[PDB]
Amino acid sequence: MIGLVGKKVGMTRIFTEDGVSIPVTVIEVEANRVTQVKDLANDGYRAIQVTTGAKKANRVTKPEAGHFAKAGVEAGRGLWEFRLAEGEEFTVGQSISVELFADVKKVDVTGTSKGKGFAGTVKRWNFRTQDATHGNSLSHRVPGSIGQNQTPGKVFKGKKMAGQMGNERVTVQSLDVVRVDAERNLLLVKGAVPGATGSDLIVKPAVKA
Amino acid sequence: MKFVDEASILVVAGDGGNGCVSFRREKYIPKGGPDGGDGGDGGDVWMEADENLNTLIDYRFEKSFRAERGQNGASRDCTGKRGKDVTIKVPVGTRVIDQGTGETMGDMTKHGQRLLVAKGGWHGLGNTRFKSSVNRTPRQKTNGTPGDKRELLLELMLLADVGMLGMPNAGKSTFIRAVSAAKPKVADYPFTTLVPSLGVVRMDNEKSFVVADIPGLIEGAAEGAGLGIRFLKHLERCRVLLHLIDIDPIDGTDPVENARIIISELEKYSQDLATKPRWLVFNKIDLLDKVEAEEKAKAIAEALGWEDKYYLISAASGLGVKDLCWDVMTFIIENPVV
Amino acid sequence: MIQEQTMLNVADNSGARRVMCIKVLGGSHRRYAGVGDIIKITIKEAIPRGKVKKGDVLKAVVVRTKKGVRRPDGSVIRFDGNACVLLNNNSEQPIGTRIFGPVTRELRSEKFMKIISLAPEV
Amino acid sequence: QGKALQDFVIDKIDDLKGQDIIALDVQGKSSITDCMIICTGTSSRHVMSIADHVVQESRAAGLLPLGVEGENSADWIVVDLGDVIVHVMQEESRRLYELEKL
RNA sequence: CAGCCAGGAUGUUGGCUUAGAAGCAGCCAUCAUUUAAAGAAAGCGUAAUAGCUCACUGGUCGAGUCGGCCUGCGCGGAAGA
RNA sequence: UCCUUGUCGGGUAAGUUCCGACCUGCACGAAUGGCGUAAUGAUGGCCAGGCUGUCUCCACCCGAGACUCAGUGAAAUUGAAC
RNA sequence: GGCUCAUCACAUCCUGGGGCUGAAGUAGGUCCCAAGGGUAUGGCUGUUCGCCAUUUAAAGUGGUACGCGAGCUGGGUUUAG
């Protein structure tokens, strides 16, 4: 079904009566106000467009302000949408709260992971490090060979070699939930979610078993 | 699992990996050292017992077993891998006989024993091992040793702790229809059971014995009377021998001489079965009165010269079958194999 | 955190005193050993009058780890001197009659509670 | 469930030829075991027969045993019933180990 | 021709090797006479027994069927970076 | 000279290297010197004890380059190239 | 030859689907389809290979000019002593 958009706050643990320590990530989810609903007649797929957070009206641009004024909803930090599950209906201007996660017991979390810059090949795919002795000269962490002698005449596409980490969407599958905070608007999920503190996250019910 | 057969196989051991002669030639220099290595040791054959297998049916199917021949030597001073040792799964209690004044190799009594039957050939030598100064160009190599070949007569013979032999259609299979868990085919006609379907009796924990079935036979030195020496071969490790004699056969002659000749033919089998302690038990006692079959039971004993307890056993009726088992079990325990 | 070619102590009266495990088990590319594991050892120093002799290769189970264990409540049980108990190669029954030093409770989950029955300390 | 389970096993193991039983109190000495009861068997078959019986009835007794030790070997086998531990043994290997001050 | 509805019996459990084989483990002189269309007989299931069957014929359907020869074009034999 | 690295022992769980020895070995070989030799050697080979990122398995940090800006300003090579 | 890096074909080492079996069940043996993934750690020797020690599902076969020094190594081969 549909999902929500929250903000990463931090990681903590929950202590249980029987003595089980379960790490938990604090997700701040606010009232998700939908902005417009797409149907088969208009574009050919069912999706509800939703926003969250608050933005100062100073830099809220006219195209963004006009779009928000069309639905009668206030400004939001960012704008997203979710796919419907073929049989549920929603109305524009409705605010989506958090209690719907009280029964899922499994949530998929997506977001932009931490950027690690132009990382090395030994870091991006755990390339084994060459010997730092026994005559080795000017080559300690270099990838080394990248092809074959004159038979391919090139380097194949998709080669695992030095690149840039982070700043990309990362998905963690079937993250167990701990508690759902409705009166304070917090989401508690067991484990570690991608991204740093203050980064926007998308949480959806788990699609796997 | 309804027939028992015996046959012979031909096992061949792989000869050793032959040596190689070579001379390395680099991309620029045309003269190089006498490159090349040794061969691979020939694969051996191991004689391993198996619980799951109980016959030699696959051995009639396959009369030849080939061990892996040792790989030849190669360049870059390469030595071939030793041939894999072929292991043959055999039922326990097998005896193997050869030709040319051949004899037994070793008796199998427990599972897990692996017997060395065929020794594979051993690897040869390459030109590199002949390195020297005066020769300085070794063109000589040593041929691999030939493998060992022999023909094995696979004789299967059961682990019958308790062996029993009785009159034809006297209830030998019916005696197994007792507490014994085996289910041999039972019918009134003579020689009802032909396949040896051995059974086991478990009176209590830590104590049990196995009982085999061997059909009766008529007095014949050769293979006459349908059955003969080919069934007597399953004997000779039976620590106790049980003799079954019918009482008042419905149509056969009453035992006064036929019960004596069966003892005589046991002497001429190979060695009188080493004169093992034989126990004589009776059958067909529920047909007549219990007290009537008492005086005539002992009369047979001195008629045949028997001075034992002459146990009275009712195999079909089930009376006294437990009494015989108690007596034999104490005798088994007090006389361990030594 | 015991690996291939690791020198450990001995925590039973079997006869070994200084031991060197040679093969950690568990699967292909088995990196390191935890607290309850089957690890193969080679005897390097033992009393000549003991039950075992130097150079024998057989299986053993680690009881104490320098790195420690992981309690499910954010706790570790570190030790000073990695130790093993002697076990037979064909059978998993331990050899030593007595066990020296404490044994952690985590060995119950690994299904070698017999060691826990010995070693009265913990 | 201390003495109730203790009396539940000693009587029933005796009905299956349970010889030379020793009731031991270990409270205050070990924090993992409560009561040490010792059972002796004639040989490998006897100790295995009683070991399977005690775990078979435990399945129908509600409590689940937490593990077994005897595998392809009857030299030492011991099974647990939670708070109470039961040791079924044989004559030969008992004197090899130490008795009654564990 | 192949199908469908039936026949398959008789002197006769065919003599030795035969414990048990009697068309179906080992030999055939290969018997022939009864009504005829059917053999002391090619195959299952055992040890035969008892039963499934076949060549053959009878009835119905009613127009091609049977396998040797030469040849054209095809199929498998023909798995590698 | 060969076969089963020659095969037994130490060294190792596992030792084509090392150490005195079995033999089917005798060529050298006695100032183109033979045997043993304490000490000595940035000499060849092997082993042991302490020790450690040599390694499983790399991680972090400190500095100089690598990067951007401002100034000066090469090189080997090049038949022409969309 | 070793280290880093891999790729491709299936004449498949395991996992997967089956046939036959002289396959009672487990355990097996042969053949067919299937390349998605995985496919070892140490002593010896420079080693390729191989022996041995010990695990697992195995420790696959070949092309890559028997891949890879404008990536490393100079241990073998190695001019000059």
Ligand SMILES: Nc1nc2c(ncn2[C@@H]2O[C@H](COP(=O)(O)OP(=O)(O)O)[C@@H](O)[C@H]2O)c(=O)[nH]1
């Ligand atoms: N009434 C009675 N019949 C028996 C007894 N023992 C055997 N029989 C019968 O004897 C018949 C033949 O026995 P069988 O298995 O052929 O013995 P075998 O001749 O040695 O092979 C069976 O059908 C039994 O019914 C007995 O004790 N009492």
Ligand SMILES: [Mg+2]
């Ligand atoms: Mg019978």
